[PDB]
Amino acid sequence: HTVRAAGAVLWRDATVEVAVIHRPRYDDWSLPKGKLDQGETEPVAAAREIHEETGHTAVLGRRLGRVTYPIPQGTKRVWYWAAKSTGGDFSPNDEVDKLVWLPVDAAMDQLQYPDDRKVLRRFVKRPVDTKTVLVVRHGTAGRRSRYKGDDRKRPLDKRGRAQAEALVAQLMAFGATTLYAADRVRCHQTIEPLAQELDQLIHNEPLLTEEAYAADHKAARKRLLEIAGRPGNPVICTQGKVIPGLIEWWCERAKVRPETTGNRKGSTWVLSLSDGELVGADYLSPPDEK
Ligand SMILES: Nc1nc2c(ncn2[C@@H]2O[C@H](COP(=O)(O)OP(=O)(O)O)[C@@H](O)[C@H]2O)c(=O)[nH]1
Ligand SMILES: [Mg+2]
Known part of the structure; x- marks a missing residue:
């Protein structure tokens, strides 16, 4: 065993x-x-x-x-x-x-x-002596097909809600201090429990949605580096078709080799920065997955 x-x-x-x-x-x-x-x-x-x-x-x-x-x-x-x-x-x-x-x-x-x-x-x-950007894929939120309404409003399901609660201890372990979410309810809900733990507001990010990233990835890259340059350790909760693009682009640019990789809902990339330079990119599985 x-x-x-x-x-x-x-x-x-x-x-x-x-x-x-x-x-x-x-x-x-x-x-x-x-x-x-x-x-x-x-x-x-x-x-x-x-x-x-x-x-x-x-x-x-x-x-x-x-x-x-x-x-x-x-x-x-x-x-x-x-x-x-x-x-x-x-x-x-x-x-x-x-x-x-x-x-x-x-x-x-x-x-x-x-x-x-x-x-x-x-x-x-x-x-x-690094600072840390925590890029989180939102938790489980059911199916686009079975949802009745503006998909932007589609909420976390029970499992995703539990993932959101289990991410508080996860992200607190890395000293999260500031909060950013793509402009989708399921992204905001993923870090709502951490917002309650820190008593911090979530900043909405229209450039980091799947649709915005698809149409203007350069604006999204620029926004990521802007958030990363601010004081504190930011959490950025976004979507599955955004995260690989951003992570692989930064890793290739910095010549950082991730030891693990994935893109699951509820997963976290821990991006370690020193003097503006990426020095680590560590993929963490969702809190309820091995
Ligand atoms: N090779 C190696 N053995 C270890 C290490 N740490 C503990 N051990 C040995 O592994 C066995 C179990 O110890 P440990 O894993 O610390 O568990 P615990 O002491 O039961 O909590 C003991 O024989 C330890 O001496 C390690 O880092 N490397
Ligand atoms: Mg031991």
Whole structure:
């Protein structure tokens, strides 16, 4: 059987230091990580494990690939994120008795596991003090054909509504702060629960609908870079025939290679930017899909 896990390179600005944790049961030094709970997404699990093992709050940024290791019951697969500390503090807990803060070169020597060192090498290979644009395909909204009315008004269905609620923890894990939706009800409804969590308004985006993108993709590209250039971490909720075009165009331009890809309803692209440059493009499946 395969156990799904998530973890992080937790870092702080002391000037970058990374957190290495000591687990006395095994007596080893490692990166924070643990198993996904039922219905949990990998990012939410990574943030939860950071808090349980380190005592810190953090904001996730770039994804740092995946580690696979054999366990008695089979295989454990761990997706890792860069995570900037935003608060809290370390007190000994059930898993961890010691935490050190080390510069990367010293952390490399401290780590027990070769695959943790590989994660740390990926961490240092690109900027970590990044801002984040979260491009979300709206949740499930039934069929165009079976809808009676202006399709622009077609609402999320029950599943899509549940996806919208499950995206709050997802997007909050990346420190979402500002909200944008294409001019379709199903796009606005997808981030309505996050708007309620942040107490922030959603900015309507007529250029980012399927019809507008089809007729003027250059206006859509320009609007995306404008939103991305503003302070904060924006969520942009749009449609299936817009997202691949925008993501592939930015990735090709920046020479960024996505490790995963897809376009499902309720999916998220985490676009990591440093000084205006795309440095990561991480596709996250919908919160209710593997
Ligand atoms: N190869 C490798 N083994 C690990 C790692 N982390 C834990 N283990 C080992 O895998 C087994 C299960 O530990 P772990 O996955 O941490 O689960 P838990 O301790 O049951 O929560 C133990 O034998 C650990 O020593 C790792 O990062 N790489
Ligand atoms: Mg383990």
